[PDB]
């Protein structure tokens, strides 16, 4: 990277170090856009969490899709008849919208969000939207 500005700026700089200090990847990245998030796992394994961030800013279609990767689950998002790993809202539920892109939610005045956020991946099918019982959600 490079820039200098401080004062305001390393407020950012300082918390974006922060994070990725325990998440997989270098402080020094890169995407610009790139974005920050808590991946909470499934819960049925050795690691209770698995931290990552990734430019996935684009269509949620991605996302999904790439989740399955980063928690080395099977999938496919094509042709599968079985439960698949989303991404929903955190305190929330609400699964993301596959048919929108994320960057929408973000602009969006009802719900200003942006990186640095948490986000939830359990298996729940295509045609879900909204997810009850974040804590639940699972079981």
Known sequence: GGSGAKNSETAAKVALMKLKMHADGDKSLPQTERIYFQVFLPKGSKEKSKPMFFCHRW?????????????????????????????????????????????????????????????????????????????????
């Open 59 to 139: 269509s949620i279609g991605k996302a999904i899709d790439f989740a399955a990767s980063l928690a080395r689950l099977k999938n496919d998002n094509n042709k599968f008849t079985a439960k698949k790993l989303r991404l929903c809202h955190i305190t929330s539920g609400e699964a993301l919208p596959l048919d929108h892109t994320l960057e929408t939610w973000i602009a969006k005045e009802d719900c200003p969000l942006y990186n640095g956020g948490n986000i939830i991946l359990e298996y729940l099918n295509d045609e879900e939207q909204f997810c009850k019982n974040v804590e639940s959600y699972l079981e």
